[PDB]
Amino acid sequence: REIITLQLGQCGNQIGFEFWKQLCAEHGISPEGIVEEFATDRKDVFFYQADDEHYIPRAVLLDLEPRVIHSILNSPYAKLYNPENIYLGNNWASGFSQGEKIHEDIFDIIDREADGSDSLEGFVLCHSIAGGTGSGLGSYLLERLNDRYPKKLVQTYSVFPNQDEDVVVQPYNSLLTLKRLTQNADCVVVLDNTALNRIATDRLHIQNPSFSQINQLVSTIMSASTTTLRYPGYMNNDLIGLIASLIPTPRLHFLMTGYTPLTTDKTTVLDVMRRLLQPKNVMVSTNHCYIAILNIIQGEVDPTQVHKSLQRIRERKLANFIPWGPASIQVALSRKSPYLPSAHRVSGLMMANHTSISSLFERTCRQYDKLRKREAFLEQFRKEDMFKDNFDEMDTSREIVQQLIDEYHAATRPDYISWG
Amino acid sequence: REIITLQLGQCGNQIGFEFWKQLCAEHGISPEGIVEEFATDRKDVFFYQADDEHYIPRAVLLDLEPRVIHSILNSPYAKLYNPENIYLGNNWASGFSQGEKIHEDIFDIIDREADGSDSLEGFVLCHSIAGGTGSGLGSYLLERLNDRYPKKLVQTYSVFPNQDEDVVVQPYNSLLTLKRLTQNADCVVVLDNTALNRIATDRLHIQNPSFSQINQLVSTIMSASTTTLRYPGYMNNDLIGLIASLIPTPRLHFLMTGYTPLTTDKTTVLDVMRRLLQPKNVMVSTNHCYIAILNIIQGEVDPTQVHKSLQRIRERKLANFIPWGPASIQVALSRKSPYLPSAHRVSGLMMANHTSISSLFERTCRQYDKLRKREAFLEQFRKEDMFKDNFDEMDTSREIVQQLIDEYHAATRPDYISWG
Amino acid sequence: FILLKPVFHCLNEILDLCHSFCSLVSQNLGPLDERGAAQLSILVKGFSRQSSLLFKILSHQINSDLAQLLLRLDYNKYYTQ
Ligand SMILES: Nc1nc2c(ncn2[C@@H]2O[C@H](COP(=O)(O)OP(=O)(O)O)[C@@H](O)[C@H]2O)c(=O)[nH]1
Numbered sequence: 001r002e003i004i005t006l007q008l009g010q011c012g013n014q015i016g017f018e019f020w021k022q023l024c025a026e027h028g029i030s031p032e033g034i035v036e037e038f039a040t041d042r043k044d045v046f047f048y049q050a051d052d053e054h055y056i057p058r059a060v061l062l063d064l065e066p067r068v069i070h071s072i073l074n075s076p077y078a079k080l081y082n083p084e085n086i087y088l089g090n091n092w093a094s095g096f097s098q099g100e101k102i103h104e105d106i107f108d109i110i111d112r113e114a115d116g117s118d119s120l121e122g123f124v125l126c127h128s129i130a131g132g133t134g135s136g137l138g139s140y141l142l143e144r145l146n147d148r149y150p151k152k153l154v155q156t157y158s159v160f161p162n163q164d165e166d167v168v169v170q171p172y173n174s175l176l177t178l179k180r181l182t183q184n185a186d187c188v189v190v191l192d193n194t195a196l197n198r199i200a201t202d203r204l205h206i207q208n209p210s211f212s213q214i215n216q217l218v219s220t221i222m223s224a225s226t227t228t229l230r231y232p233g234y235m236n237n238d239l240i241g242l243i244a245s246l247i248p249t250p251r252l253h254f255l256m257t258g259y260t261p262l263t264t265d266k267t268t269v270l271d272v273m274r275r276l277l278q279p280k281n282v283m284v285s286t287n288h289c290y291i292a293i294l295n296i297i298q299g300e301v302d303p304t305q306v307h308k309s310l311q312r313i314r315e316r317k318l319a320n321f322i323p324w325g326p327a328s329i330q331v332a333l334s335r336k337s338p339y340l341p342s343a344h345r346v347s348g349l350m351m352a353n354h355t356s357i358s359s360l361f362e363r364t365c366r367q368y369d370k371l372r373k374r375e376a377f378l379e380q381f382r383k384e385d386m387f388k389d390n391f392d393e394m395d396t397s398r399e400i401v402q403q404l405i406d407e408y409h410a411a412t413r414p415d416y417i418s419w420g
Numbered sequence: 421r422e423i424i425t426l427q428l429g430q431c432g433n434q435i436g437f438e439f440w441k442q443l444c445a446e447h448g449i450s451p452e453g454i455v456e457e458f459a460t461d462r463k464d465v466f467f468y469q470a471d472d473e474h475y476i477p478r479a480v481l482l483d484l485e486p487r488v489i490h491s492i493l494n495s496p497y498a499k500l501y502n503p504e505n506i507y508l509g510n511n512w513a514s515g516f517s518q519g520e521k522i523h524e525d526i527f528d529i530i531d532r533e534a535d536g537s538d539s540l541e542g543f544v545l546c547h548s549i550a551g552g553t554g555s556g557l558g559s560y561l562l563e564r565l566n567d568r569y570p571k572k573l574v575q576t577y578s579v580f581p582n583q584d585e586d587v588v589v590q591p592y593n594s595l596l597t598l599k600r601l602t603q604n605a606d607c608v609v610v611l612d613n614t615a616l617n618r619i620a621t622d623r624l625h626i627q628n629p630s631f632s633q634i635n636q637l638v639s640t641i642m643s644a645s646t647t648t649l650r651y652p653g654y655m656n657n658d659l660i661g662l663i664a665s666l667i668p669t670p671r672l673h674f675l676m677t678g679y680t681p682l683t684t685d686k687t688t689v690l691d692v693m694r695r696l697l698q699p700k701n702v703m704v705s706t707n708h709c710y711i712a713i714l715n716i717i718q719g720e721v722d723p724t725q726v727h728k729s730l731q732r733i734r735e736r737k738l739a740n741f742i743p744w745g746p747a748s749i750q751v752a753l754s755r756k757s758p759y760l761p762s763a764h765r766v767s768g769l770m771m772a773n774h775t776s777i778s779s780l781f782e783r784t785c786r787q788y789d790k791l792r793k794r795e796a797f798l799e800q801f802r803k804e805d806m807f808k809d810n811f812d813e814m815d816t817s818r819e820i821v822q823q824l825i826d827e828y829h830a831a832t833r834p835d836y837i838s839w840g
Numbered sequence: 841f842i843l844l845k846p847v848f849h850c851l852n853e854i855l856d857l858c859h860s861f862c863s864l865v866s867q868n869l870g871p872l873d874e875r876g877a878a879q880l881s882i883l884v885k886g887f888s889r890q891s892s893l894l895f896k897i898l899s900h901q902i903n904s905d906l907a908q909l910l911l912r913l914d915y916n917k918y919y920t921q
């Protein structure tokens with residue numbers, strides 16, 4: 001079934017704008033939305049088919065008090081995305097309240113696309129955590145979607161924000177988002193601003209314009225995570241089959257990301273596989289262990305190398321994991337596209353369930369716990385107090401995320417057979 | 421097993437910086453650690469393997485009151501050594517105390533590499549004796565390593581300092597270092613600033629910039645001492661296998677150096693051997709006799725003549741020794757590398773246990789004994805007095821080094837079968 | 841020298857007895873006089889008798905076979921005994 005992407009918030013709208021542009025050039029598409037003449041791939045899932053080959057992405061763009069939003073509209077690709085479905089604070093509470101009054105028109109825009117498609121399998125959100133308007137509005141829309149569309153499976157390309165710690169309420173906003181995400185997301189793929197900023201400092205000298213350049217890094221991961229779905233394959237063609245292996249227990253649905261070519265701008269599989277297990281290529285910042293690992297390689301890979309390669313990574317043990325889940329690394333292979341350059345034709349990515357990401361969740365919980373005692377930034381803005389007089393959703397969120405922090409470490413232990 | 425080199429102190433950090441650079445060009449490695457396109461060697465021991473051919477050596481760089489650690493960072497080879505493991509007085513006591521507060525983080529940096537490697541066989545220290553910060557910190561780290569790795573062995577490329585005798589406490593600092601080095605070091609390779617300075621005056625006119633030029637001399641010896649391990653061969657295919665012959669009794673573990681073409685910038689094996697036994701080729705400054713001798717040759721060497729060379733060297737008797745040890749000299753061979761110049765097509769080095777080095781130890785013990793009576797430089801710095809109020813470790817060191825001075829001369833005697 | 845039986849059927853034993861000694865030392869880090877000493881000294885004497893016997897045999901006159909003696913004759917340790 002076709003996938004509908006609910007890109008929301010200024011930050012989320014920036015990475016959806018680029019992700020669709022990335023699949024414009026990668027696929028046989030043009031800024032008008034029509035196919036290029038020069039142009040064997042499965043464009044049905046991601047791109048709606050118009051009568052005159054105007055393959056329009058099924059993007060849902062949500063904006064709130066737009067000013068810099070108009071920049072997406074003044075672009076050569078404005079015609080490419082024309083489902084004609086765009087509808088008009090820095091606080092999590094401020095975003096949640098604004099979403100509630102406009103919920104029905106934004107929800108009808110969801111319906112239109114659902115009716116238009118032959119079918120709808122999942123809602124992929126370009127979510128921004130502690131995103132000012134992006135968070136709060138995104139949590140609320142996350143709660144409505146599961147109730148209305150229980151059958152579908154949701155994913156979140158959460159850009160978890162770590163900038164070395166401006167938002168003084170950033171921990172409070174993030175704390176609330178996770179309680180909803182844990183509760184109302186079937187899957188989440190985690191990314192980190194600092195981890196990518198550190199990569200940007202590593203591969204390039206770019207430091208001050210970190211957000212503009214890092215957009216390309218988030219994009220390469222995003223296009224890559226779905227390339228097996230976008231291009232024809234003998235296995236995991238459906239999104240669901242892919243999702244099951246990466247998330248073995250429902251609560252632990254957060255996925256770590258890595259790219260074998262930190263710089264993609266021959267190499268045998270035995271090599272490309274080993275790079276994913278080096279921490280310099282990872283993009284995320286008591287014993288600790290992965291729960292299950294998966295990898296997808298691109299290009300005309302030599303296959304015999306993989307049997308040697310898979311048995312080879314095994315002797316290397318570069319990846320240390322002994323979870324409750326069996327955790328064999330899974331090997332996938334896909335075709336690099338026939339439009340984009342063949343430089344570094346072989347290039348890989350890995351998506352894995354790792355207990356280390358628990359540490360990133362605890363750090364915002366640490367900032368929040370410190371901030372909660374001080375009550376330095378309760379906002380006490382009338383919106384914040386009137387929306388939350390008890391201020392007990394933050395405590396409800398704190399116990400739910402602490403259960404998550406606890407569950408992760410329970411995964412490390414030998415007995416996750418018992419309740420976690 | 422892979423060797424981890426704990427280069428410490430400004431002087432020690434200078435000779436580790438160069439030694440790794442020397443094996444950069446000698447091996448197939450560029451300044452960014454990338455496999456060279458132009459490029460048969462065993463690089464596994466000295467160089468860790470990153471997936472995209474980043475040959476990063478397992479160097480542990482320790483900085484204290486840093487100045488030359490910042491210059492090491494602004495170099496083209498900064499990328500080549502990136503285990504990302506560098507962590508922030510002229511007195512032996514001043515160095516030992518500073519090391520004790522930071523011991524656990526520097527020790528975790530040791531652990532990381534030990535865990536990362538398939539295995540760890542030895543810790544090779546680019547130690548500086550009476551090195552201000554380098555000594556004291558180096559003695560303390562020498563004591564911790566043996567306790568944590570009781571099975572593992574520690575070598576020391578001690579640059580014993582002789583500059584014609586500025587440090588007014590130099591004898592006191594050196595006295596303390598040896599006591600630790602005699603009971604807590606499995607092997608030590610001795611070098612001398614004056615001996616090399618005399619060589620520098622001999623081969624070249626360089627006198628005033630003695631430290632910069634002599635670095636190259638220490639390096640040629642250092643790269644050379646390991647070439648049998650770094651390149652595969654019939655015998656001495658592991659450090660320990662080689663170490664045993666050079667050190668026959670545990671206390672006498674100090675090794676003298678020499679190089680046949682000091683001016684390496686054809687020659688038969690019979691010639692390169694005789695040249696080495698002569699004392700100009702030696703780099704160190706009552707009957708006296710060697711305990712055992714060993715030699716390694718890397719060049720265009722004929723095989724049928726090497727045994728005949730040992731016989732020919734036996735007839736010359738240029739090397740006089742009648743020690744308790746039964747170890748006779750052996751003719752060893754190693755592989756000269758391609759790419760770098762092949763000048764002095766045949767070129768050699770010798771590592772030997774000689775009782776003459778006892779004399780260098782006694783000279784610092786002589787300066788110290790004279791200095792101890794005067795008490796001219798007790799430092800009495802509160803660090804020095806508070807750390808050592810009794811000042812009895814210096815006396816403990818004096819008896820231990822005197823036992824060593826005595827043991828050596830006992831070796832010269834016909835009865836080392838009796839206790840020495 | 842594999843072709844000639846005597847040098848081969850005596851050197852092999854020099855290695856096999858050494859394996860047994862290597863095993864006795866391998867048994868414990870604590871000092872072992874539990875019949876180890878009885879055989880360890882029989883072994884020191886046993887290894888000297890054979891080690892000197894082949895020293896005597898060593899001393900086509902191949903340069904390799906005769907020249908090998910001189911590494912041991914640097915101290916003349918076995919002959920002097
Ligand atoms: N990855 C990425 N993150 C961004 C970018 N711009 C902003 N952000 C993130 O967006 C978050 C704040 O959202 P914000 O821009 O305030 O949303 P707004 O309230 O709509 O302005 C911060 O946590 C930033 O890390 C970008 O270009 N790339």
Ligand SMILES: Nc1nc2c(ncn2[C@@H]2O[C@H](COP(=O)(O)OP(=O)(O)O)[C@@H](O)[C@H]2O)c(=O)[nH]1
Binds near residue numbers: 509631
């Ligand atoms: N071989 C060699 N020894 C050096 C060099 N530079 C300094 N030293 C030695 O280092 C010792 C003093 O250490 P020092 O440089 O004071 O360490 P600091 O306290 O960090 O400055 C002296 O004994 C010198 O012989 C060098 O370039 N080569």
